[PDB]
Amino acid sequence: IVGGQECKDGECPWQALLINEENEGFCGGTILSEFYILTAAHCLYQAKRFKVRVGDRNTEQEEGGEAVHEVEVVIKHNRFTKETYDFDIAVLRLKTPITFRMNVAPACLPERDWAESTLMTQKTGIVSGFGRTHEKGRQSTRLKMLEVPYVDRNSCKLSSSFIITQNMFCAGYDTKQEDACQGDSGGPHVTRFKDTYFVTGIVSWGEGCARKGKYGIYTKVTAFLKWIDRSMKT
Amino acid sequence: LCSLDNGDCDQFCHEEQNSVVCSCARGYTLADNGKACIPTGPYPCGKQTLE
Numbered sequence: 190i191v192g193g194q195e196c197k198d199g200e201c202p203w204q205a206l207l208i209n210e211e212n213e214g215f216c217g218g219t220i221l222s223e224f225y226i227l228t229a230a231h232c233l234y235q236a237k238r239f240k241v242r243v244g245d246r247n248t249e250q251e252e253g254g255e256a257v258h259e260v261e262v263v264i265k266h267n268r269f270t271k272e273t274y275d276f277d278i279a280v281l282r283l284k285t286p287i288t289f290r291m292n293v294a295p296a297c298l299p300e301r302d303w304a305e306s307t308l309m310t311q312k313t314g315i316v317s318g319f320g321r322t323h324e325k326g327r328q329s330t331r332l333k334m335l336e337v338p339y340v341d342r343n344s345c346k347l348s349s350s351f352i353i354t355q356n357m358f359c360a361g362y363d364t365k366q367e368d369a370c371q372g373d374s375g376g377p378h379v380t381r382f383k384d385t386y387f388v389t390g391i392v393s394w395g396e397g398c399a400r401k402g403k404y405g406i407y408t409k410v411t412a413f414l415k416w417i418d419r420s421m422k423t
Numbered sequence: 424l425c426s427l428d429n430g431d432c433d434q435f436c437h438e439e440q441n442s443v444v445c446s447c448a449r450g451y452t453l454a455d456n457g458k459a460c461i462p463t464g465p466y467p468c469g470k471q472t473l474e
């Protein structure tokens with residue numbers, strides 16, 4: 190995350206991290222329930238073998254609440270397309286259930302219509318992760334969070350150099366040096382409504398990170414709510 | 424209706440038969456006032472952890 194602040198104790202409990210064979214995080218995830226993690230389908234190509242760590246806030250000091258979980262099933266969207274990042278969504282069923290505690294809790298799944306009219310019309314959403322703090326920097330050691338305004342679909346479609354399918358949306362700033370980045374991918378985009386956070390997006394991609402005239406592109410979770418529900422039963 | 428302050432609902436709002444009906448995410452129970460959402464157990468979804 191470029192800019193923004195680090196998540197303080199218990200502020201981003203739904204944050205999950207996908208870690209590779211060498212224990213380094215390469216993508217993010219969102220805790221949907223004790224058995225399911227919502228991530229980006231394009232991350233499943235980032236590493237051969239990987240696990241999901243939860244309750245982590247400082248990858249440089251075992252604070253106690255951390256918990257590593259093996260992945261039992263990887264449910265990638267059948268229509269995901271590598272060349273364009275379309276249908277960038279995947280659900281992970283864990284071998285063992287996540288025990289909710291401080292810094293380990295799920296994000297709420299909203300209902301499509303209500304989310305699109307009420308949640309996505311909010312001024313802002315919240316993106317978070319352990320991803321780079323600079324376009325060409327190193328991954329972050331501390332979990333960070335950034336308030337990213339929702340971007341008008343057209344101003345966003347116009348700004349992008351690649352096709353913004355109906356399965357994605359834009360968020361972030363036009364010029365302000367604040368934006369998700371590499372490593373944050375697959376991570377959560379949540380919108381707060383009356384002190385309860387609802388998952389509204391999956392960090393998908395972007396042209397660089399926090400570049401001017403460019404925004405952050407997220408997978409439109411509201412367009413895959415029926416899909417998520419079915420994947421969390423198989 | 425639901426366009427007016429979310430229909431007074433804590434969470435989901437749907438306009439049925441020209442009326443407003445509130446509902447909640449899995450893990451919550453609609454309060455007796457049919458608007459508020461009460462958590463079913465500990466660590467309900469969408470809530471930052473305090474203990």
Ligand SMILES: O=C1[C@@H](NS(=O)(=O)c2cc3ncccc3s2)CCN1Cc1cc2ccncc2[nH]1
Pocket residue numbers: 272273274351368369370371372373374392393394395396397398399405406
């Ligand atoms: O800079 C970049 C991107 N390269 S490109 O601009 O040439 C793009 C080429 C491309 N081709 C097809 C669809 C979308 C793109 S974007 C790819 C990922 N990344 C790194 C990157 C990952 C990430 C996650 C969240 N926010 C910003 C982010 N930038």
Ligand SMILES: [Ca+2]
Pocket residue numbers: 245246247248249250251252253255
């Ligand atoms: Ca730690």
